[PDB]
Chain A
Amino acid sequence: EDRLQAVVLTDSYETRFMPLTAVKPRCLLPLANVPLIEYTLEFLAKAGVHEVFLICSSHANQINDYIENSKWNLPWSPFKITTIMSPEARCTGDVMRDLDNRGIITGDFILVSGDVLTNIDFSKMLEFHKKMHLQDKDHISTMCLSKASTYPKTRTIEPAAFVLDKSTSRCIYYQDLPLPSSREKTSIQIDPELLDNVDEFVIRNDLIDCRIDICTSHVPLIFQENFDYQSLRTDFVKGVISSDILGKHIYAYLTDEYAVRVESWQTYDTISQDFLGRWCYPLVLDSNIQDDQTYSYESRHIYKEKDVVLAQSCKIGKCTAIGSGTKIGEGTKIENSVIGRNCQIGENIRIKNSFIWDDCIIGNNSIIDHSLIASNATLGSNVRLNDGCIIGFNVKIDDNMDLDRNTKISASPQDLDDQTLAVSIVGDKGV
């Protein structure tokens, strides 16, 4: 039950964020107006940590600085942050190998890939895991899966068709399909290797990725043994099914309450929206986590920090949130959009269903629809943006532009159109 170490895969899913992640590390980017790492840390604490470990890689100095800044740094914390520093660029097998080389591995150690923030109480889960362990020697690792709104629709990267058990809760098949977006390989398989032993076959698909694992003493040794598992989902579960290490059990925890991990950009937006609303049991910003935070709760699902001002006569839809150091002008038509920290507003702006990051000037006469504006990137006069316009680092949107739907703009100070220098591409400008 007690004494459990935390190991979290950081600096791993870079470039999966299609424009971002190159100069500053993946996790250091400001999520919901305040750093992503903190939420994850809090979650870990809630679960039950005794020492914090992250597998940092991309530019370690900044990570070190962050650690220095952080609250877990000085004596008062039950757990300190001392990140594992390794050679540059390596996969999850390689990461595991590195960890093994380093040495600090325990019995019931915790392994979470990427960054996650959800509500479900973990103590019960832990207890269940322990019980399972107490049953037989062959039990391995824990899966986290949650139910969704009947039919799948906003799921293409990970629409896993889980064939599952009710009596023992154990996986039978795993498949990722591009069927809702590109109808080319519509395929479902039922393997016969565990067919005439289970009998209670349940065919399901409507479940969401969390990538949170409680790992026993078997896992790192297994990793060390088999160099074919460079990944952890598509190869691993299949291998387990196939009985590479013969006759072993895996758990599939099924919860009625909502649980999703961080993956893409629309998904990120959805997560943010959820956080803003009361979709997960207690999660709030107004409670204040990181030192200098001065957040306060308001009615009509509205979040306001201190040093926050919005002016009179703004007839609005529903749900708005503002960061600190913000001055908002007069006469605006707004529906379900979010404005970040130290963002300035002149006059006359229409906004619908949006999220805005750190220090982004919403210029005079501008429309933001389902589109993001990132750190130091600013909007000037007469910009007409549409649904899903992704903006990265230092995109200085200056004078007169019209960008179409689903357009992606490059970040780091290359592969995709529209660049960092003055005005985004409508009339060719750059180097």
Chain B
Amino acid sequence: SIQAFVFCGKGSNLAPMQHSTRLPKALLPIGNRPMIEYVLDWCDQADFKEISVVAPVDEIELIESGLTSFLNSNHSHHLQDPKKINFISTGESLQKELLPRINGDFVILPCDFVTDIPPQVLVDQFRNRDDNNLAMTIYYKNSLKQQQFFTVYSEILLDVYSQRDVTKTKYLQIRSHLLWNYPNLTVSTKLLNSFIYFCSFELCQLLKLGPQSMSRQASFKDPFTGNQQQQNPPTTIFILPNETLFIRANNLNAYMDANRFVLKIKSQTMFTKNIQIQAAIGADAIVDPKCQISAHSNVKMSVLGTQANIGSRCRVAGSLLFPGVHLGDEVILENCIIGPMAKIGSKCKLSNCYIEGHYVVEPKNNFKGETLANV
């Protein structure tokens, strides 16, 4: 019943970088880390074993090699190459081909992703309402013309009209039978779909009865209008896709995204500069180079300075570090600002005590005692 789909191919729609047959798109060194690292992380978070990977006609081994290189997962990935597609469409042709092997509900994610939002909560939401289709939307930048059709209705969160504009019609075109029901519609002029899909078992027999597939966006979810007359039998909640709003930045690349992403990255993110030993407790952490760290490390919204050594079990809750500090054996912190030369530890649970310059911490109790320079 539980399964995940990973899509990975080649890009040619973009303006620039791509010319030779040797370099495709799977192994891009834009800024040290590959594009698919985020995807890998997401997969790890999700925790799954049977994940099927799909590939088109071109490149049969290079992708595999890429997957192998650099490498945590250590699971068992499977890849197949059915040869019928000739780049015109993404995975609909594959879907049409493989149908009885599908066990149940599936999670679909393409290779083009940059994520900062919470992970499995989409999946959980999908599980909850128990419907056929789900997709998400992301706002346009506030920093330096009409775009495309987006409409929302909520009291529950659902989608009404989704058809894009490339050959844009002058007036806003919809349906009134899809308006008489749901009488409080809103037209949005900000939203953008970012390639997130969640589907069910029931839509596996309808593709063989009537082929309709177009570009995975033009027709993939379009049959939702159940009004007026209806002249097609239902397969065994009304057949409707859903839309959910978000705040944090998780954009897509298709037409105009290559230079902005880099800017967004380099200025913030999950920082890596030196050797690390890495499931871990503590969301969002800021680590510095030259240091040596151990496992079971707890960081709660904290920024380090130049060279900060952590050794054997530590709990940090809102503490900042300045040039050159030593830590050894059992440290628990609550609300502290630290200056130059500090050797903090000696096993204590301290709240509202500030550490000043040149001091070694002794195992003693002192209430409201400000750590003064010298006695």
Contact = CB atoms under 8 A, between A and B. Distances in A.
B268 interface: no
Contacts, number: 36
Contact of B183 (A187, A196, A204): A204
B187 A202 contact: yes
Contact of A206 (B171, B172, B184, B189): B184
B83 to A, nearest CB: 47
B312 to A, nearest CB: 56
B278 interface: no
Contact of A203 (B171, B179, B189): B179
Contacts of B21: none
A196 B146 contact: yes
Contact of B186 (A188, A190, A192, A201): A201
Interface string A172-212: 00000001000000111010100110011111111000000
B208 interface: no
A186 B176 contact: yes
Contact of A201 (B180, B184, B187): B187
Contacts of A192: 170-171
Contact of A190 (B146, B172, B189): B172
B185 interface: yes
A205 B176 CA distance: 12
A428 B183 CA distance: 49
Contacts of A188: 176, 179
Given A188-B179, A196-B146, A203 B170 contact: no
Interface string B185-214: 111010000000000000000000000000
A205 B185 CA distance: 9
Interface string B328-346: 0000000000000000000
Interface string A219-235: 00000000000000000
Given A188-B176, A190-B172, A203 B146 contact: no
Interface residues of A, number: 19
A202 B182 CA distance: 12
A150 B186 contact: no
Contacts of B185: 202-204
A188 B179 CA distance: 9
Contacts of A195: 172
B176 A203 contact: no
A413 interface: no
Interface in A45-70: none
Interface string B160-186: 000000000011100010011101111
A187 B175 CA distance: 10
Nearest to A187: B176
A199 B184 contact: no
B171 A202 contact: no
Contacts of B189: 199-201
A76 interface: no
Contacts of B172: 190, 195
A204 B186 CA distance: 8
Nearest to B186: A202
B170 A205 contact: no
A152 interface: yes
Nearest to A204: B184
Interface in A132-158: 150-152
5 contacts: A188-B179, A195-B172, A196-B146, A202-B186, A203-B185
Interface of A: 150-152, 179, 186-188, 190, 192, 195-196, 199-206
Interface of B: 146, 170-172, 176, 179-181, 183-187, 189
The 3 closest A-B pairs by CB, nearest first: A201-B187, A203-B185, A199-B189
